[PDB]
Design a protein around this ligand. Structure first.
Ligand SMILES: [N+]
Ligand SMILES: [N+]
Length: 227
């Protein structure tokens, strides 16, 4: 009974939370996935979403200034991490020296105009002093899921991906990765919000309470997010 717009980094997490949420509360979570920025437009245009799980905090804040949000509704549900990643175990070294030494032609990022995880990537390359040399090599996905898939499918040698896409059981579980240290970019604070069409909706209220709950908190951290 709850239409949720879900930033692509949070695709697998919400599919998992949706299964326990349905069983526990009886309300069905119907999720659309995509870039935070694309949902900003859809919401502005009348999309039926009732809850919005952003990959940032500024987009929910922007929507509230423009009257699309229930005041009092904004909270942080997860804090993400950026990783440089390749499915090839020898390719991305433990310190990220490939960004400086590598011979790759394609570096995958999510569209930084719509994807907070892409913005974190361009902040990190900028603070590394590598924006001018890596810029020509960039290939932009429409969201962090597409950016990841470019690397997984071999359309780019490596990419800046969401930790949630490669992390299981407290560990990067596949390929080779460098965890981007936070000082290189703004913390990836991911905020949730009840939208106008979710005001006074029982499933919407149940969901945000659930996201703050014990079963949701354990799943969220199992994908590498901090709370
Ligand atoms: N930056
Ligand atoms: N820091």
């Amino acid at each position: 009974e709850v239409q949720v717009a879900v930033a692509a980094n949070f695709t697998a997490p919400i599919q998992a939370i949706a299964k326990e949420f349905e069983k526990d509360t009886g309300h069905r979570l119907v999720a659309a996935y995509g870039a935070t920025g694309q949902f900003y437009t859809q919401i502005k245009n009348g999309a039926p979403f009732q809850v919005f799980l952003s990959a940032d905090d500024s987009t929910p804040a922007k929507l509230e200034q423009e009257g699309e949000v229930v005041p009092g509704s904004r909270f942080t549900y997860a804090i993400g991490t950026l990783a440089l990643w390749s499915p090839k175990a020898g390719y991305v070294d433990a310190e990220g020296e490939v960004l400086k030494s590598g011979s790759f032609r394609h570096l995958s990022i999510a569209n930084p105009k719509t994807a907070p995880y892409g913005l974190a990537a361009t902040q990190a390359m900028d603070k590394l002093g590598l924006a001018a040399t890596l810029g020509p090599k960039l290939v932009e996905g429409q969201n962090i899921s597409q950016a990841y898939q470019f690397v997984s499918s071999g359309n780019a040698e490596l990419g800046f991906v969401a930790l949630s896409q490669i992390y299981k059981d407290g560990k990067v579980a596949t390929g080779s990765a460098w965890i981007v240290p936070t000082e290189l970019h703004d913390p990836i604070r991911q905020d949730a919000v009840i939208l106008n069409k979710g005001k006074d909706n029982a499933a919407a209220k149940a969901l945000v309470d659930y996201l703050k709950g014990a079963k949701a908190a354990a799943l969220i951290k199992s994908y590498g997010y901090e709370l």
